[PDB]
Write a protein that binds this ligand. Structure first.
Ligand SMILES: [Zn+2]
Ligand SMILES: [Zn+2]
Lengths: 89, 62, 237
RNA sequence: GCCCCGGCGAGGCGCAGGCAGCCGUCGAACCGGGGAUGCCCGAAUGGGACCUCCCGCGGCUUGCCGCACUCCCAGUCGGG
RNA sequence: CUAGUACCGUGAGGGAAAGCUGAAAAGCACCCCGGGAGGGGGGUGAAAAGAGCCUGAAACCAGGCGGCGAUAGGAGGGUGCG
RNA sequence: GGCAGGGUGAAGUCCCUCAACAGAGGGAUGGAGGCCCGCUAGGGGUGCUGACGCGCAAUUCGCUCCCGUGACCCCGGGCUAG
RNA sequence: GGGAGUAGCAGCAUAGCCGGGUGAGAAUCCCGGCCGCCGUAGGGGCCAGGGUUCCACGGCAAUGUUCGUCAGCCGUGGGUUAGUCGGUCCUAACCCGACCCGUAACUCGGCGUCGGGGAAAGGGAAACGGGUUUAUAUUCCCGUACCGCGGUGGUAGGUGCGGCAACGCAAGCCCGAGGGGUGACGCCUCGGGGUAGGCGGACCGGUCCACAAGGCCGGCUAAGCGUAUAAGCCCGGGGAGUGCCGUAAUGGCGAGAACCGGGUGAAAGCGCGAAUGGCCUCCCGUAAGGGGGGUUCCGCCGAUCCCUGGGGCCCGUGAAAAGCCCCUCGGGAACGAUCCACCGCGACCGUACCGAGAACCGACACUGGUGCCCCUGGGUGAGAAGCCUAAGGCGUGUCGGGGGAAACCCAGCCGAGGGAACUCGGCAAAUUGGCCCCGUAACUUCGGGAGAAGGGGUGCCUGCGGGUGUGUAACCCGCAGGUCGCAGUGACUAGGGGGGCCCGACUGUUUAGUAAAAACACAGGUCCCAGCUAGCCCGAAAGGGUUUGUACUGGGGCCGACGCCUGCCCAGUGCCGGUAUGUGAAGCCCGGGUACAACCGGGUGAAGCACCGGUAAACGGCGGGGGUAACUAUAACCCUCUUAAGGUAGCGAAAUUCCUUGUCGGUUAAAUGCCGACCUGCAUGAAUGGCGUAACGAGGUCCCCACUGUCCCCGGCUGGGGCCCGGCGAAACCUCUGC
């Protein structure tokens, strides 16, 4: 093992080969899930991945269609209601 | 103690490497200047009247 | 001879310098040349621990969008609105000029001269009390007991600083003191001068005793001010 | 080690006593005078140097010239 | 003399040793032994002066010759007689 | 970047029986500590006043002994100069 | 030259033998077999550092602690192939330049800002398996993939939908501006799901055994593409308390529980990739090569590897930026992709080998150090312990041969009867030892002391039972009986214990290389300066440290956990403050003197000195001769003799006591020792702290139980040296000599 792989940011895994070798493969770690701006609660409908993984997805497979996809639904409804009630006069 | 065993700790990075201007191994790599000619610190050459090395290089009397 | 610790500190080396890259930024109010007569409104959006401060700090977002840090008062809530200016109410957390603050009020973060950003009464649990108002000066009682006059246009914030009672509990262990000192790169552990050699300290020598009065004149030169510097008295009472 | 003009007048191919060969009488080697080519670093200067190696802008047609700092004359071009 | 060179030190810096065949390479053709380095016979040259090369001292070592040499007492010498 | 394995059992959270002016007694959970045993790895150096002492070594070896989740051990990049 | 053909070529890993071969020549080189060593490292992988040590052929003058046909040695020729691996990007702590300021000046010192640098283990686009070479391979070849840029051609869209909702969807292009997220994070502890690896049974194909059964070997499947649940979060319906739901544990609910349904969401698994590909095996003349076969099922343990959720601690809060995804705005065009298929392009450097008891540093082929930096099968077993052992590696921790192996030494084993009589001293050695049950003193800061002490038991075989579990799967817990031995933690592993005294509270640190401690530090106590253009400090200055700070703060001293306490003295030295009455230098003023000065005499004149006061958890200090009671004694007390004041509480022959082995008592047959008391304290005493003190100590010291070759008193064994033999081959020392 090289020093770059003695580093615990590489998540080693053991894998048996079609030739009977049983080698070690190295991969980088996955980033965590998107969180709400107001409450810090987790979001739904948003996939996890590194940039190369996210660039192999279309636009509509990355976020929910509804407005304000960066907020949890309760906070979204708060925002829409406040807009409405300020659009009265 | 202070002798033979601490001499084993000599596989770190070197204090001095080869110098681009004068060809000697006197370029301090953490500080960024040469201990012989002054490259990296001086546009002019380091030259002292108490030193013999430049006179030896030019086969001069002291 | 050899040098003292107090003389080596002046050189400015890593052994003595504060690690302020670790901290949250400095704490200052808002400049007058941008809060002249406007009475700005802001909302508190976070309360944070600061490693270089002894008091908790709060993050305030203002209307334009500007975010800033303030020293937090005992009682302030996340989601609360504060006001900075001359026509701000008298309520815990608001910043006003001393000329608009009644007598008997508890006050913190007082400026020395108007516009200087805040200098006085900053530590956890401290408070100052407004004593007298006049047209040329406002007299305030500082936590040292001392009465001091300020210009009436100097700004202060109303309430008490948060984080009091800190010293109610013993440190207990040497290791906890290790970590507390490392957090601000204080010289720790501390040596005694009477168990140093004579080359190292004006005390010092193999018989471990001060052999001359420990009271030292205000006019003594550096390298010689150790013990009780210009003491008016000594002892128990 | 490449070219030219003069001299010298037959051998020459560095210190350096070899095997194979080549240059020279269409004037060499050698001597005097004058030209051409002249990698990288270095004041080192288009921009950067933990390894005398790397990375760019333009504009003319790969092939080409120019692009540092401080200052003088100027002046929105340039000459020092 | 392939010297501020080889070499030593993290570095400022420190710093050696080492000249001569012969007029001419004419630098030992040929035979026996030896695994070989080499030895021995033969040759070149006025002379081996043979590259481990002008002369070639002393200390030291081996063999040959001469004198002494296992009943014996003084810093290693002096005088006299064999 | 790292530290085999085992022990003890702090706060916090409770259950049952008999009673309730007060209380009495029996069962668990939980996993703290500059806590304990430990030649895990690592770090250190108490005694034999042992071996060695022109050494394996210009400070080493062996037996025995100490720490071992912490004021702990180590690595790459930097800073302080008579 | 002598020393000397001598010492050394032992000790921490004692390894060779037989047969065959090469070659002039073989203990030392090659093949086979037997016998051995390492086996959580002496094996595997790989940084820095080294630099060709790598490979093949040929050699043996020198090197190699012996030899040598061998080699990290000598000679001759060869060898390092990348869009995907690393460097070229980003910032960290930090560094530099310009401008600016300082310096007699500078190659010197600074500096906010502007810019530029700074990580081959931090952040950070994209490739896996098999073969091929003497020597390179995620780099060449085969197969199958991915990324970025740029094109071509179609489509979704612009100008479209399904769901109450959570959400599900190909769901428009170019340029710019904001916002959100991710990047992006500490220590400790626990559950759930997976994997690598291991184990057990069946079947096939092989192999080892008088037989015999039985034992042992092989029984495989990458990236990539496609495919969905778990926790957690969420959406709808529903409508609760003398309560109900849940966890290993904490918990949850009208601020909306139970219960019905659903949505989004990891690591994995599955399919394709993929086969005479890889492995095992069976027949033929064996050069090309030839030929045919097998590649299957259940079950158990499982991590220190991967994913996912909970809980706890902080006077301590555990990086940043580039890059990447999404949303909304503003400005443009009429077109046109984040979808499908195809086509082209993808520069520079590194890439061999060692990686250490012989390729690095230590002058060496050095028992040291760098690196134990990352990783490791089966059995016993708590165990990465020790012991045996597979794989892999080695027989080179590079001199051998003889010997019933003389004395003597190094490292080990046993020792009758006594049991510390040895010695400064029980130094060294011995004793004890694992697990289960019983039982456990003083003292205590009530936490401990404590594994106190002390006592019983333990093997094999045959049978019964329990817990969890679907289980004659797997792990763990009890009982009874029979039986053998001197001995059942039978080897390995594996505490000797108790009682007094002194110091230091404890964990921690220290004189690299004669001192590990009673010395340092520590929590805590108390004193001093300071309201910030401060106080303390660096510097020639400019500027700067404490300071991204502001009295619950920053700096400066002394004592040193905890408990009971901390007496008197401000005359002296020191520090602080106050009044000026004195004195007080230059300068100013007055007068004389000088055709002008130098000069002479007076006054004023700050800080400081003097004078008045405050201050001892400031430096420091804390007094004899005299007399007396119901008879011998000693004197509460009384005369007393001087200073600033005249040693309080306590302790006391002390780590402090000169006479000293003080005296009395205890411990011994016997005490210059130890403990307890007494007090003429040469020369104790209260934060240079005083007196005590549970727990702790490789600290110093006295005693008791046990144990022993320490001793009486020395004896016998085992390996390695010493001695003889063959080989390599020094040094310190040396006037000449030597009853
Ligand atoms: Zn939200
Ligand atoms: Zn140089």
């Amino acid at each position: 093992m090289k020093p770059m792989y003695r580093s615990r940011s590489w998540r080693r895994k053991y894998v048996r080969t079609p030739g009977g070798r049983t080698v070690i493969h190295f991969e980088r770690r996955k980033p965590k899930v998107a969180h709400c701006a107001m409450c810090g609660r987790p979001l739904n409908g948003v996939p996890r991945g590194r940039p190369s993984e996210l660039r192999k997805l279309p636009k509509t497979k990355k976020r929910p269609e509804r407005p304000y996809p960066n907020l949890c639904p309760s906070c979204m409804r708060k925002v829409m209601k406040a807009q409405v009630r300020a659009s009265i006069t | 103690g202070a002798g033979t065993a601490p001499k084993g700790k000599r596989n770190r990075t070197p204090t001095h490497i080869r110098c681009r201007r004068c060809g000697r191994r006197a370029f301090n790599v953490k500080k960024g200047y040469c201990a012989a000619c002054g490259f990296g610190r001086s546009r002019r050459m380091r030259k002292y009247s108490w030193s013999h090395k430049w006179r030896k290089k030019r086969n001069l009397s002291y | 001879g050899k040098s003292l610790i107090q003389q080596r500190r002046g050189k400015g080396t890593t052994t003595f310098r504060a690690p302020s890259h670790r901290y949250r930024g400095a704490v200052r109010y808002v400049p007058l040349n941008l809060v002249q007569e406007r009475t700005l409104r802001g909302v508190v959006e976070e309360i944070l621990h600061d490693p270089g401060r002894t008091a908790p700090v709060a993050r305030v977002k203002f209307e334009d969008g500007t975010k800033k840090l303030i020293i937090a008062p005992e009682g302030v809530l996340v989601g609360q609105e504060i006001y900075i200016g001359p026509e701000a109410p008298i309520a815990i957390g608001n910043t006003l000029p001393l000329a608009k603050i009644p007598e008997g009020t508890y006050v913190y973060d007082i400026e020395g001269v108007p516009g200087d950003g805040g200098k006085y009464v900053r530590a956890g649990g401290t408070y100052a009390l407004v004593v007298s108002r006049e047209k040329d000066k406002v007299i305030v009682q500082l936590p040292s007991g001392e009465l001091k006059a300020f210009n009436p246009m100097c700004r202060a914030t109303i309430g008490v600083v948060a984080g009091g009672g800190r010293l109610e509990k013993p440190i207990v262990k040497a290791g906890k003191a290790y970590y507390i000192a490392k957090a601000r790169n204080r010289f720790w552990p501390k040596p005694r001068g009477v168990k140093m050699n004579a080359v190292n300290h004006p005390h010092g020598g193999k018989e471990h005793h001060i052999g001359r009065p420990s009271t030292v004149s205000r006019r003594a030169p550096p390298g010689r001010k150790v013990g009780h510097i210009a003491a008016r008295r000594t002892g128990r009472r």
